[PDB]
Amino acid sequence: GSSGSSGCSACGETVMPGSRKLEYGGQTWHEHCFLCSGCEQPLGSRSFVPDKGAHYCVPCYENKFASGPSSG
Ligand SMILES: [Zn+2]
Ligand SMILES: [Zn+2]
């Protein structure tokens, strides 16, 4: 309404609309800041699955949501 704050949640900088950026659940991350909480890969280009405050790629998601005694 009054103003808008779409700054990066990773570094804190100010994400401008005139550049490749990301926005999920309301937050905003830089195309270089938005990474995966599993392999630390830049999902700013590759697909992924937004989980509990955690961004996991196709695999990082299907793997964590997979049934198995796997310790890690
Ligand atoms: Zn950033
Ligand atoms: Zn990943």
mmCIF file of N, CA, C and O and ligand atoms in Angstrom:
data_model
loop_
_atom_site.group_PDB
_atom_site.id
_atom_site.type_symbol
_atom_site.label_atom_id
_atom_site.label_comp_id
_atom_site.label_asym_id
_atom_site.label_seq_id
_atom_site.Cartn_x
_atom_site.Cartn_y
_atom_site.Cartn_z
ATOM 1 N N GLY A 1 0.806 -1.207 0.000
ATOM 2 C CA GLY A 1 0.000 0.000 0.000
ATOM 3 C C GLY A 1 0.842 1.260 0.000
ATOM 4 O O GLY A 1 0.986 1.919 -1.030
ATOM 5 N N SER A 2 1.401 1.598 1.158
ATOM 6 C CA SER A 2 2.228 2.791 1.289
ATOM 7 C C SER A 2 3.551 2.619 0.549
ATOM 8 O O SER A 2 3.874 3.388 -0.356
ATOM 9 N N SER A 3 4.312 1.601 0.940
ATOM 10 C CA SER A 3 5.602 1.328 0.318
ATOM 11 C C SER A 3 5.799 -0.171 0.111
ATOM 12 O O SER A 3 4.975 -0.980 0.534
ATOM 13 N N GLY A 4 6.899 -0.532 -0.543
ATOM 14 C CA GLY A 4 7.186 -1.933 -0.794
ATOM 15 C C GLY A 4 8.640 -2.280 -0.546
ATOM 16 O O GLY A 4 9.540 -1.594 -1.031
ATOM 17 N N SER A 5 8.872 -3.348 0.210
ATOM 18 C CA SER A 5 10.228 -3.782 0.526
ATOM 19 C C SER A 5 10.474 -5.201 0.023
ATOM 20 O O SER A 5 10.168 -6.177 0.709
ATOM 21 N N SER A 6 11.031 -5.309 -1.178
ATOM 22 C CA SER A 6 11.316 -6.607 -1.776
ATOM 23 C C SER A 6 12.816 -6.883 -1.789
ATOM 24 O O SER A 6 13.375 -7.296 -2.804
ATOM 25 N N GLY A 7 13.464 -6.650 -0.652
ATOM 26 C CA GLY A 7 14.894 -6.876 -0.552
ATOM 27 C C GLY A 7 15.240 -8.348 -0.428
ATOM 28 O O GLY A 7 14.392 -9.165 -0.071
ATOM 29 N N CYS A 8 16.490 -8.686 -0.727
ATOM 30 C CA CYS A 8 16.947 -10.068 -0.650
ATOM 31 C C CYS A 8 16.932 -10.566 0.792
ATOM 32 O O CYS A 8 17.333 -9.852 1.711
ATOM 33 N N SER A 9 16.469 -11.798 0.982
ATOM 34 C CA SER A 9 16.398 -12.391 2.313
ATOM 35 C C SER A 9 17.671 -13.172 2.627
ATOM 36 O O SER A 9 17.891 -13.591 3.763
ATOM 37 N N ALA A 10 18.506 -13.364 1.612
ATOM 38 C CA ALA A 10 19.758 -14.091 1.778
ATOM 39 C C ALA A 10 20.870 -13.168 2.264
ATOM 40 O O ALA A 10 21.438 -13.374 3.337
ATOM 41 N N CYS A 11 21.178 -12.150 1.468
ATOM 42 C CA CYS A 11 22.223 -11.196 1.816
ATOM 43 C C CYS A 11 21.629 -9.957 2.482
ATOM 44 O O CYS A 11 22.255 -9.341 3.343
ATOM 45 N N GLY A 12 20.414 -9.600 2.077
ATOM 46 C CA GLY A 12 19.755 -8.438 2.644
ATOM 47 C C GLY A 12 19.705 -7.270 1.679
ATOM 48 O O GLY A 12 18.965 -6.312 1.893
ATOM 49 N N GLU A 13 20.498 -7.351 0.614
ATOM 50 C CA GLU A 13 20.542 -6.290 -0.386
ATOM 51 C C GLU A 13 19.144 -5.986 -0.919
ATOM 52 O O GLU A 13 18.166 -6.624 -0.528
ATOM 53 N N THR A 14 19.059 -5.006 -1.813
ATOM 54 C CA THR A 14 17.784 -4.614 -2.398
ATOM 55 C C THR A 14 17.621 -5.192 -3.800
ATOM 56 O O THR A 14 18.272 -4.747 -4.745
ATOM 57 N N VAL A 15 16.749 -6.187 -3.927
ATOM 58 C CA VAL A 15 16.500 -6.825 -5.215
ATOM 59 C C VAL A 15 15.675 -5.921 -6.125
ATOM 60 O O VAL A 15 14.524 -5.606 -5.825
ATOM 61 N N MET A 16 16.272 -5.509 -7.239
ATOM 62 C CA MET A 16 15.591 -4.643 -8.194
ATOM 63 C C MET A 16 14.850 -5.466 -9.242
ATOM 64 O O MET A 16 15.270 -6.561 -9.618
ATOM 65 N N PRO A 17 13.719 -4.931 -9.726
ATOM 66 C CA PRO A 17 12.896 -5.601 -10.738
ATOM 67 C C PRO A 17 13.575 -5.643 -12.102
ATOM 68 O O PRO A 17 13.187 -6.418 -12.976
ATOM 69 N N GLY A 18 14.593 -4.807 -12.278
ATOM 70 C CA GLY A 18 15.311 -4.765 -13.539
ATOM 71 C C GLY A 18 16.451 -5.762 -13.589
ATOM 72 O O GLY A 18 17.524 -5.462 -14.114
ATOM 73 N N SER A 19 16.222 -6.951 -13.041
ATOM 74 C CA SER A 19 17.241 -7.993 -13.020
ATOM 75 C C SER A 19 16.645 -9.328 -12.585
ATOM 76 O O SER A 19 15.631 -9.370 -11.888
ATOM 77 N N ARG A 20 17.281 -10.418 -13.004
ATOM 78 C CA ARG A 20 16.813 -11.755 -12.660
ATOM 79 C C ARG A 20 16.728 -11.928 -11.146
ATOM 80 O O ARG A 20 17.742 -11.905 -10.449
ATOM 81 N N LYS A 21 15.510 -12.101 -10.643
ATOM 82 C CA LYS A 21 15.290 -12.278 -9.213
ATOM 83 C C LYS A 21 14.280 -13.391 -8.952
ATOM 84 O O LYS A 21 13.701 -13.949 -9.885
ATOM 85 N N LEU A 22 14.069 -13.706 -7.679
ATOM 86 C CA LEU A 22 13.126 -14.751 -7.295
ATOM 87 C C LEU A 22 12.254 -14.295 -6.129
ATOM 88 O O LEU A 22 12.666 -13.461 -5.323
ATOM 89 N N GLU A 23 11.049 -14.849 -6.046
ATOM 90 C CA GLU A 23 10.120 -14.501 -4.978
ATOM 91 C C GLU A 23 9.179 -15.664 -4.674
ATOM 92 O O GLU A 23 8.377 -16.065 -5.519
ATOM 93 N N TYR A 24 9.282 -16.199 -3.463
ATOM 94 C CA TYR A 24 8.443 -17.316 -3.047
ATOM 95 C C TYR A 24 7.877 -17.083 -1.650
ATOM 96 O O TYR A 24 8.556 -16.551 -0.773
ATOM 97 N N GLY A 25 6.625 -17.486 -1.451
ATOM 98 C CA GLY A 25 5.987 -17.313 -0.160
ATOM 99 C C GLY A 25 5.955 -15.863 0.282
ATOM 100 O O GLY A 25 5.619 -15.563 1.426
ATOM 101 N N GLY A 26 6.308 -14.961 -0.629
ATOM 102 C CA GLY A 26 6.313 -13.546 -0.307
ATOM 103 C C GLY A 26 7.712 -12.963 -0.277
ATOM 104 O O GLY A 26 7.920 -11.811 -0.657
ATOM 105 N N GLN A 27 8.673 -13.760 0.178
ATOM 106 C CA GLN A 27 10.059 -13.315 0.259
ATOM 107 C C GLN A 27 10.648 -13.111 -1.134
ATOM 108 O O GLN A 27 9.991 -13.373 -2.142
ATOM 109 N N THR A 28 11.891 -12.643 -1.184
ATOM 110 C CA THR A 28 12.568 -12.403 -2.452
ATOM 111 C C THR A 28 14.057 -12.714 -2.348
ATOM 112 O O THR A 28 14.745 -12.211 -1.460
ATOM 113 N N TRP A 29 14.548 -13.543 -3.261
ATOM 114 C CA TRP A 29 15.957 -13.920 -3.272
ATOM 115 C C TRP A 29 16.584 -13.641 -4.634
ATOM 116 O O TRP A 29 15.908 -13.691 -5.662
ATOM 117 N N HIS A 30 17.881 -13.348 -4.634
ATOM 118 C CA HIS A 30 18.599 -13.062 -5.871
ATOM 119 C C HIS A 30 18.819 -14.338 -6.679
ATOM 120 O O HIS A 30 19.009 -15.415 -6.116
ATOM 121 N N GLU A 31 18.791 -14.207 -8.002
ATOM 122 C CA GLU A 31 18.985 -15.350 -8.886
ATOM 123 C C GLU A 31 20.257 -16.110 -8.520
ATOM 124 O O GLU A 31 20.465 -17.243 -8.958
ATOM 125 N N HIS A 32 21.106 -15.479 -7.715
ATOM 126 C CA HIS A 32 22.358 -16.095 -7.289
ATOM 127 C C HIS A 32 22.314 -16.449 -5.806
ATOM 128 O O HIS A 32 23.145 -17.213 -5.313
ATOM 129 N N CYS A 33 21.338 -15.889 -5.098
ATOM 130 C CA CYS A 33 21.185 -16.143 -3.671
ATOM 131 C C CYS A 33 20.247 -17.321 -3.426
ATOM 132 O O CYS A 33 20.486 -18.145 -2.543
ATOM 133 N N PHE A 34 19.180 -17.396 -4.215
ATOM 134 C CA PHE A 34 18.206 -18.474 -4.084
ATOM 135 C C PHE A 34 18.831 -19.818 -4.442
ATOM 136 O O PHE A 34 18.916 -20.183 -5.616
ATOM 137 N N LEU A 35 19.267 -20.551 -3.424
ATOM 138 C CA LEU A 35 19.886 -21.856 -3.631
ATOM 139 C C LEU A 35 19.065 -22.958 -2.968
ATOM 140 O O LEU A 35 18.041 -22.691 -2.339
ATOM 141 N N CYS A 36 19.524 -24.198 -3.110
ATOM 142 C CA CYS A 36 18.834 -25.340 -2.524
ATOM 143 C C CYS A 36 19.374 -25.646 -1.131
ATOM 144 O O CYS A 36 20.572 -25.517 -0.876
ATOM 145 N N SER A 37 18.484 -26.051 -0.231
ATOM 146 C CA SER A 37 18.870 -26.372 1.137
ATOM 147 C C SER A 37 19.382 -27.805 1.236
ATOM 148 O O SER A 37 19.366 -28.410 2.307
ATOM 149 N N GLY A 38 19.836 -28.344 0.108
ATOM 150 C CA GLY A 38 20.347 -29.701 0.087
ATOM 151 C C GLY A 38 21.686 -29.807 -0.615
ATOM 152 O O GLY A 38 22.647 -30.342 -0.060
ATOM 153 N N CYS A 39 21.751 -29.297 -1.840
ATOM 154 C CA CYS A 39 22.981 -29.338 -2.622
ATOM 155 C C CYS A 39 23.572 -27.939 -2.779
ATOM 156 O O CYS A 39 24.655 -27.773 -3.341
ATOM 157 N N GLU A 40 22.854 -26.941 -2.277
ATOM 158 C CA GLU A 40 23.308 -25.557 -2.363
ATOM 159 C C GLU A 40 23.445 -25.118 -3.817
ATOM 160 O O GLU A 40 24.375 -24.395 -4.172
ATOM 161 N N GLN A 41 22.511 -25.561 -4.653
ATOM 162 C CA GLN A 41 22.529 -25.214 -6.070
ATOM 163 C C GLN A 41 21.579 -24.057 -6.359
ATOM 164 O O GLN A 41 20.522 -23.921 -5.741
ATOM 165 N N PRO A 42 21.960 -23.203 -7.321
ATOM 166 C CA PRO A 42 21.155 -22.044 -7.713
ATOM 167 C C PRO A 42 19.877 -22.445 -8.441
ATOM 168 O O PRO A 42 19.873 -22.622 -9.660
ATOM 169 N N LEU A 43 18.792 -22.585 -7.688
ATOM 170 C CA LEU A 43 17.505 -22.965 -8.262
ATOM 171 C C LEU A 43 16.896 -21.807 -9.046
ATOM 172 O O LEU A 43 15.786 -21.913 -9.567
ATOM 173 N N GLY A 44 17.631 -20.702 -9.128
ATOM 174 C CA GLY A 44 17.148 -19.541 -9.851
ATOM 175 C C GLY A 44 16.922 -19.829 -11.323
ATOM 176 O O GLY A 44 16.398 -18.988 -12.053
ATOM 177 N N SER A 45 17.321 -21.019 -11.760
ATOM 178 C CA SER A 45 17.166 -21.413 -13.155
ATOM 179 C C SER A 45 16.542 -22.801 -13.261
ATOM 180 O O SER A 45 15.772 -23.079 -14.181
ATOM 181 N N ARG A 46 16.880 -23.669 -12.314
ATOM 182 C CA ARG A 46 16.355 -25.029 -12.299
ATOM 183 C C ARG A 46 15.112 -25.123 -11.421
ATOM 184 O O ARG A 46 14.932 -24.331 -10.496
ATOM 185 N N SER A 47 14.256 -26.096 -11.718
ATOM 186 C CA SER A 47 13.026 -26.291 -10.957
ATOM 187 C C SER A 47 13.333 -26.776 -9.543
ATOM 188 O O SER A 47 14.442 -27.228 -9.257
ATOM 189 N N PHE A 48 12.343 -26.679 -8.663
ATOM 190 C CA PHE A 48 12.505 -27.107 -7.278
ATOM 191 C C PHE A 48 11.154 -27.200 -6.575
ATOM 192 O O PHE A 48 10.108 -26.979 -7.186
ATOM 193 N N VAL A 49 11.185 -27.526 -5.287
ATOM 194 C CA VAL A 49 9.964 -27.648 -4.500
ATOM 195 C C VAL A 49 10.086 -26.898 -3.179
ATOM 196 O O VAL A 49 10.875 -27.256 -2.304
ATOM 197 N N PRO A 50 9.285 -25.833 -3.027
ATOM 198 C CA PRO A 50 9.284 -25.010 -1.813
ATOM 199 C C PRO A 50 8.694 -25.746 -0.616
ATOM 200 O O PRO A 50 7.481 -25.935 -0.527
ATOM 201 N N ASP A 51 9.559 -26.158 0.305
ATOM 202 C CA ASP A 51 9.124 -26.871 1.499
ATOM 203 C C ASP A 51 9.220 -25.978 2.732
ATOM 204 O O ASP A 51 9.531 -24.791 2.629
ATOM 205 N N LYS A 52 8.948 -26.555 3.898
ATOM 206 C CA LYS A 52 9.004 -25.812 5.151
ATOM 207 C C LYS A 52 10.241 -24.921 5.202
ATOM 208 O O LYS A 52 11.327 -25.372 5.564
ATOM 209 N N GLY A 53 10.069 -23.654 4.836
ATOM 210 C CA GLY A 53 11.181 -22.722 4.849
ATOM 211 C C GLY A 53 12.450 -23.324 4.280
ATOM 212 O O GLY A 53 13.554 -22.927 4.650
ATOM 213 N N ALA A 54 12.292 -24.287 3.378
ATOM 214 C CA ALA A 54 13.435 -24.945 2.756
ATOM 215 C C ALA A 54 13.186 -25.193 1.273
ATOM 216 O O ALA A 54 12.159 -25.756 0.891
ATOM 217 N N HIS A 55 14.131 -24.769 0.440
ATOM 218 C CA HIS A 55 14.013 -24.944 -1.004
ATOM 219 C C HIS A 55 14.824 -26.149 -1.472
ATOM 220 O O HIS A 55 16.055 -26.114 -1.485
ATOM 221 N N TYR A 56 14.126 -27.213 -1.857
ATOM 222 C CA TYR A 56 14.782 -28.428 -2.322
ATOM 223 C C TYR A 56 14.439 -28.707 -3.783
ATOM 224 O O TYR A 56 13.272 -28.679 -4.176
ATOM 225 N N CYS A 57 15.466 -28.975 -4.583
ATOM 226 C CA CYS A 57 15.277 -29.259 -6.000
ATOM 227 C C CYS A 57 14.431 -30.514 -6.196
ATOM 228 O O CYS A 57 14.111 -31.215 -5.237
ATOM 229 N N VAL A 58 14.072 -30.790 -7.446
ATOM 230 C CA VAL A 58 13.265 -31.959 -7.769
ATOM 231 C C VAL A 58 13.713 -33.176 -6.965
ATOM 232 O O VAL A 58 12.924 -33.816 -6.270
ATOM 233 N N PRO A 59 15.011 -33.502 -7.059
ATOM 234 C CA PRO A 59 15.594 -34.642 -6.346
ATOM 235 C C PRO A 59 15.660 -34.411 -4.841
ATOM 236 O O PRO A 59 15.188 -35.234 -4.055
ATOM 237 N N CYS A 60 16.249 -33.288 -4.444
ATOM 238 C CA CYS A 60 16.378 -32.949 -3.032
ATOM 239 C C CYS A 60 15.020 -32.995 -2.335
ATOM 240 O O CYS A 60 14.942 -33.094 -1.111
ATOM 241 N N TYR A 61 13.955 -32.923 -3.125
ATOM 242 C CA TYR A 61 12.600 -32.954 -2.585
ATOM 243 C C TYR A 61 12.047 -34.376 -2.583
ATOM 244 O O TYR A 61 11.560 -34.862 -1.564
ATOM 245 N N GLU A 62 12.128 -35.037 -3.734
ATOM 246 C CA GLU A 62 11.635 -36.403 -3.866
ATOM 247 C C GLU A 62 12.470 -37.366 -3.025
ATOM 248 O O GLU A 62 12.038 -38.478 -2.724
ATOM 249 N N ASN A 63 13.668 -36.929 -2.651
ATOM 250 C CA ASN A 63 14.565 -37.752 -1.846
ATOM 251 C C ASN A 63 14.221 -37.640 -0.364
ATOM 252 O O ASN A 63 14.170 -38.642 0.350
ATOM 253 N N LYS A 64 13.987 -36.415 0.093
ATOM 254 C CA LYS A 64 13.647 -36.170 1.490
ATOM 255 C C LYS A 64 12.257 -36.709 1.813
ATOM 256 O O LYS A 64 11.987 -37.119 2.942
ATOM 257 N N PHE A 65 11.380 -36.707 0.815
ATOM 258 C CA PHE A 65 10.017 -37.196 0.995
ATOM 259 C C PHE A 65 9.914 -38.670 0.611
ATOM 260 O O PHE A 65 8.821 -39.188 0.386
ATOM 261 N N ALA A 66 11.061 -39.338 0.541
ATOM 262 C CA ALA A 66 11.100 -40.752 0.187
ATOM 263 C C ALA A 66 11.266 -41.624 1.427
ATOM 264 O O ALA A 66 11.958 -41.249 2.373
ATOM 265 N N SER A 67 10.625 -42.788 1.416
ATOM 266 C CA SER A 67 10.698 -43.711 2.542
ATOM 267 C C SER A 67 11.979 -44.537 2.487
ATOM 268 O O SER A 67 12.264 -45.195 1.487
ATOM 269 N N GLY A 68 12.751 -44.494 3.569
ATOM 270 C CA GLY A 68 13.994 -45.242 3.624
ATOM 271 C C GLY A 68 14.749 -45.017 4.919
ATOM 272 O O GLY A 68 14.749 -43.921 5.480
ATOM 273 N N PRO A 69 15.410 -46.073 5.414
ATOM 274 C CA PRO A 69 16.184 -46.011 6.658
ATOM 275 C C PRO A 69 17.445 -45.165 6.514
ATOM 276 O O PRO A 69 18.146 -44.907 7.492
ATOM 277 N N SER A 70 17.727 -44.735 5.288
ATOM 278 C CA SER A 70 18.906 -43.921 5.016
ATOM 279 C C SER A 70 19.135 -42.907 6.133
ATOM 280 O O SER A 70 18.263 -42.091 6.434
ATOM 281 N N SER A 71 20.314 -42.965 6.743
ATOM 282 C CA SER A 71 20.659 -42.054 7.829
ATOM 283 C C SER A 71 20.769 -40.619 7.321
ATOM 284 O O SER A 71 20.214 -39.695 7.914
ATOM 285 N N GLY A 72 21.491 -40.443 6.219
ATOM 286 C CA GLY A 72 21.663 -39.119 5.649
ATOM 287 C C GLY A 72 20.981 -38.975 4.303
ATOM 288 O O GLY A 72 20.825 -39.972 3.600
HETATM 289 ZN ZN ZN B 1 21.100 -11.514 -2.311
HETATM 290 ZN ZN ZN B 2 19.220 -29.659 -4.275
#
